[PDB]
Amino acid sequence: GNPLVYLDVDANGKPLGRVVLELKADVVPKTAENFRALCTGEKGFGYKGSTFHRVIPSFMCQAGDFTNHNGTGGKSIYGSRFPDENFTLKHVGPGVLSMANAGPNTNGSQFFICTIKTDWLDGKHVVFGHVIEGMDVVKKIESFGSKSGRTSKKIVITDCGQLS
C-alpha cells in the first residue's frame, strides 16, 4: 500500500514531536518515491538535519532545502529537477503535503504542509500526500513563523524515515 513516512522535529534543540505522512504513490508514484527516498536517505542525501526555512501563519510550512537551507536549493533523486507529474489531487485543507517549485516543471526536494485550504495553488503545485498524525506539531511550527516567512526559532528535522 501507500508508504507512511515520518519527520521528527526540534525547535531550538527541544523536541516538538513527530509528523507522520501518507504518500499517495497510487496517484503520484514518481513524486511519492522522491519524497520517500529523501526521508530514508537511501541515496546518500535527504532531509535529515535540514530545516523548515519558510513558515507563514495561516498558510504553510515549507522545508526541504538540504543543500542551501534558504529556498534556493535541494535536488531530487532523479536529477536537479523533475516535471510536474499530474495535478489530480487538490489542496483540500489543512494537512495537505505539496511540492514547492519555481514555476512549471521545477520540482526538486522542497515541500510544504498546508495549514489552511490553499485552493489557489491547484494546478500549480503537485499534491502528493497528507498528514495522518501530528497536526498538533505542525500547528506548533506554524506558531513560530511570520508574515515574511522568517522563523522565530530554528526548526530542524532531526530524524526522518519510513514506517511502512
Curated annotation (Swiss-Prot):
Location of the protein in the cell: Mitochondrion matrix
Modified residues (S-nitrosocysteine): C160
GO terms of biological process kind: apoptotic mitochondrial changes; cellular response to arsenic-containing substance; cellular response to calcium ion; cellular response to hydrogen peroxide; mitochondrial depolarization; mitochondrial outer membrane permeabilization involved in programmed cell death; necroptotic process; negative regulation of apoptotic process
Residues carrying N6-acetyllysine: K24, K124
Domain PPIase cyclophilin-type, residue spans: 6-162
Modified-residue entries (N6-succinyllysine), positions: K24, K43, I132, K147
Main location: mitochondrion
Keyword presence, Acetylation: yes
This enzyme's EC code(s): 5.2.1.8
Catalytic activity, reaction form: [protein]-peptidylproline (omega=180) = [protein]-peptidylproline (omega=0)
Domain of life, source organism: Eukaryota
Alphabetical UniProt keywords: Acetylation, Apoptosis, Isomerase, Mitochondrion, Necrosis, Rotamase, S-nitrosylation, Transit peptide
Post-translational modifications reported in the UniProt record: Acetylated at Lys-124; deacetylated at Lys-124 by SIRT3.
One GO CC term, this protein: mitochondrion
GO molecular function: cyclosporin A binding; peptidyl-prolyl cis-trans isomerase activity
Regulation: Inhibited by cyclosporin A (CsA). Is displaced by CsA from the mPTP leading to a lower open probability of the mPTP.
Assembly description: Associates with the mitochondrial membrane ATP synthase F(1)F(0) ATP synthase; the association is increased by inorganic phosphate (Pi) and decreased by cyclosporin A (CsA). Interacts with ATP5F1B; ATP5PD and ATP5PO. Interacts with SLC25A3; the interaction is impaired by CsA. Interacts with BCL2; the interaction is impaired by CsA. Interacts with TP53; the association implicates preferentially tetrameric TP53, is induced by oxidative stress and is impaired by CsA. Interacts with C1QBP. Interacts with MCUR1.
Family named by the database record: Belongs to the cyclophilin-type PPIase family.
Role this protein plays: PPIase that catalyzes the cis-trans isomerization of proline imidic peptide bonds in oligopeptides and may therefore assist protein folding. Involved in regulation of the mitochondrial permeability transition pore (mPTP). It is proposed that its association with the mPTP is masking a binding site for inhibiting inorganic phosphate (Pi) and promotes the open probability of the mPTP leading to apoptosis or necrosis; the requirement of the PPIase activity for this function is debated. In cooperation with mitochondrial p53/TP53 is involved in activating oxidative stress-induced necrosis.
Name of the protein in question: Peptidyl-prolyl cis-trans isomerase F, mitochondrial
Organism of derivation: Homo sapiens
Originating gene: PPIF
